[PDB]
Design a protein around this ligand. Structure first.
Ligand SMILES: *[C@@H](CC(=O)OCC)[C@H](C[C@@H]1CCNC1=O)NC(=O)[C@@H](CC(=O)[C@@H](NC(=O)c1cc(C)on1)C(C)C)Cc1ccc(F)cc1
Length: 159
C-alpha cells in the first residue's frame, strides 16, 4: 500500500511519510493555495528548502499509514527505487544507484540534493519518492526534481 501514499499534488505528486508528514517538490505546488487536504495553510507547518517542500499537519490526515524514516540522501552506491506514478494511474518503479550528495548553504539555510543513475522520467514526475529498505524499516531519501536530457541521470532533492 506504499503506492497509496503517492497522491497527485499540484502539477506533480507528493508522498505521505507519516499520518501527518507530507513531502513534495516545491515548484509543483499552486502559488495560490490557501488550504491542503482540508486544512488551512495557516494551521500547517511548512518548511521549504529549495525544491524540497515539507508539510506537517496539526492532526493525523492519513490515519491508515505507518511512519517511515525521512533521511537526507543515501550512502553513495546505494540503489533505491523511484516510485513514479503516471497520470494514467500506471505504476512504474525505477531502479537508480545514488551518487554524489551535495548541499549549499546561505544565511543558516541549507538546500540539498543527490544525483543518481537509472539502472524514464518525464516532466510530470516531480514529487515522486525515492525509497530503499534498511533492515525492517523503509527509508525515504527525497522527491525527484530533475533528470538529464536523454540519459540515465536523475536528481532527488533532499531536506
Ligand atoms: C519535473 C518538474 C516539472 O513540473 O516539470 C516541468 C517544469 C521535471 C522532470 C524532468 C524533466 C524531463 N524529465 C524529468 O524527469 N524537472 C524539471 O523540469 C527541472 C529541470 C530539469 O529536469 C532539466 N534537467 C536538468 O536540469 C538536469 C541537470 C542534470 C545533471 O540532470 N538534469 C530538463 C530535463 C528540463 C526543473 C523543475 C521545474 C519545476 C519543479 F517543480 C521542479 C524542477
Amino acid at each position: 500500500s506504499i503506492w497509496s501514499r503517492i497522491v497527485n499534488f499540484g502539477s506533480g505528486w507528493g508522498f505521505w511519510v507519516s499520518p501527518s508528514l507530507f513531502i513534495t517538490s516545491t515548484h509543483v505546488i499552486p502559488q495560490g493555495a490557501k488550504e491542503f487536504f482540508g486544512v488551512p495553510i495557516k494551521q500547517i507547518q511548512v518548511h521549504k528548502s529549495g525544491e524540497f517542500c515539507r508539510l506537517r499537519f496539526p492532526k493525523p490526515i492519513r490515519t491508515d499509514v505507518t511512519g517511515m524514516i525521512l533521511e537526507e540522501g543515501a550512502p553513495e552506491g546505494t540503489v533505491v527505487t523511484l516510485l513514479i506514478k503516471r497520470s494514467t494511474g500506471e505504476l512504474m518503479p525505477l531502479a537508480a544507484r545514488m551518487g554524489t550528495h551535495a548541499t549549499m548553504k546561505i544565511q543558516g539555510r541549507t538546500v540539498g540534493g543527490q544525483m543518481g543513475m537509472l539502472l524514464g522520467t518525464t516532466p510530470g514526475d516531480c514529487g515522486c519518492p525515492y525509497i530503499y529498505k534498511r533492515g525492517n524499516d523503509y527509508v525515504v531519501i527525497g522527491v525527484h526534481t530533475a533528470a538529464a536530457r536523454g540519459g540515465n541521470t536523475v536528481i532527488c532533492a533532499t531536506q
